[PDB]
Design a protein around this ligand. Structure first.
Ligand SMILES: COc1cc(-c2cn(C)c(=O)c(C)c2C)ccc1C1(N2CCN(C)CC2)CC1
Length: 121
């Protein structure tokens, strides 16, 4: 209800998408976001799609944001987390992609905390 506190389960409104779009754009503009901007190209990693069952990337999240796919903030955070978890599953810790996931994930958490602090019904 309008009287209850905001949480990760609060239904997202059209208004909340202004902040989600801002957060997503900030990730897309980060210099270390290059491994995640688009789906992994099978030619760059021929075994990838036989290992990673649920791929995710920032362009797919942008499409989902445009379609208002996310009903609760938990679902948005889950897709973002899948990007980084897939990266850390598939790649060794010394991979440049893994290093990009470590910086971009804590940047996402910084931005998400700001989104949450600013949110009202
Ligand atoms: C080696 O460069 C990349 C690697 C990945 C990648 C990302 N993530 C998360 C992975 O887990 C794996 C396994 C990979 C391979 C993404 C993009 C590129 C870039 N392009 C290379 C040439 N290609 C034709 C277009 C993309 C942008 C430099």
């Amino acid at each position: 209800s309008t009287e209850d506190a905001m949480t990760v389960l609060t239904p997202l409104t059209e208004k909340d998408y202004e902040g989600l779009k801002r957060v997503l754009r900030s990730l897309q503009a980060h210099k270390m976001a290059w491994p995640f901007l688009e789906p992994v190209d099978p030619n760059d990693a021929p075994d990838y799609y036989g290992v990673i069952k649920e791929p995710m990337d920032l362009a797919t999240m942008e499409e989902r944001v445009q379609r208002r796919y996310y009903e609760k903030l938990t679902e948005f955070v889950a897709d973002m987390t899948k990007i980084f978890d897939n990266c850390r599953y598939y790649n060794p810790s010394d991979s440049p992609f893994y290093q990009c996931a470590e910086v971009l994930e804590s940047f996402f958490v910084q931005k998400l905390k700001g989104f949450k602090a600013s949110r009202s019904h």
